[PDB]
């Protein structure tokens, strides 16, 4: 909803755990990122 720029909310396909990935830095993180 109110996520920072560059980060995107995605969902796994094997299990189904929601996570955040950055298309700019090309990395994922489970912990709510900041900026």
Curated annotation (Swiss-Prot):
Gene designation: PIN1
Domain of life: Eukaryota
GO MF annotation terms: beta-catenin binding; cis-trans isomerase activity; cytoskeletal motor activity; GTPase activating protein binding; mitogen-activated protein kinase kinase binding; peptidyl-prolyl cis-trans isomerase activity; phosphoprotein binding; phosphoserine residue binding
Record function comment: Peptidyl-prolyl cis/trans isomerase (PPIase) that binds to and isomerizes specific phosphorylated Ser/Thr-Pro (pSer/Thr-Pro) motifs. By inducing conformational changes in a subset of phosphorylated proteins, acts as a molecular switch in multiple cellular processes. Displays a preference for acidic residues located N-terminally to the proline bond to be isomerized. Regulates mitosis presumably by interacting with NIMA and attenuating its mitosis-promoting activity. Down-regulates kinase activity of BTK.
WW domain residues: 2-35
The species this protein was found in: Homo sapiens
Domain notes: The WW domain is required for the interaction with STIL and KIF20B.
Keyword Isomerase applies: yes
Subunit and partners: Interacts with STIL. Interacts with KIF20B. Interacts with NEK6. Interacts (via WW domain) with PRKX. Interacts with BTK. Interacts (via PpiC domain) with DAPK1. Interacts with the phosphorylated form of RAF1. Interacts (via WW domain) with ATCAY; upon NGF stimulation. Interacts with PML (isoform PML-4). Interacts with BCL6. Interacts with FBXW7, disrupting FBXW7 dimerization and promoting FBXW7 autoubiquitination and degradation. Directly interacts with RBBP8/CtIP; this interaction depends upon RBBP8 phosphorylation.
Gene Ontology cellular-component annotations: ciliary basal body; cytoplasm; cytosol; glutamatergic synapse; midbody; nuclear speck; nucleoplasm; nucleus
The name this protein goes by in its record: Peptidyl-prolyl cis-trans isomerase NIMA-interacting 1
Tissue localization of expression: Expressed in immune cells in the lung (at protein level).
Biological process terms in GO annotation: cellular response to hypoxia; negative regulation of amyloid-beta formation; negative regulation of cell motility; negative regulation of ERK1 and ERK2 cascade; negative regulation of protein binding; negative regulation of protein catabolic process; negative regulation of SMAD protein signal transduction; negative regulation of transforming growth factor beta receptor signaling pathway
Alphabetical keyword list: Acetylation, Cell cycle, Cytoplasm, Isomerase, Nucleus, Phosphoprotein, Rotamase
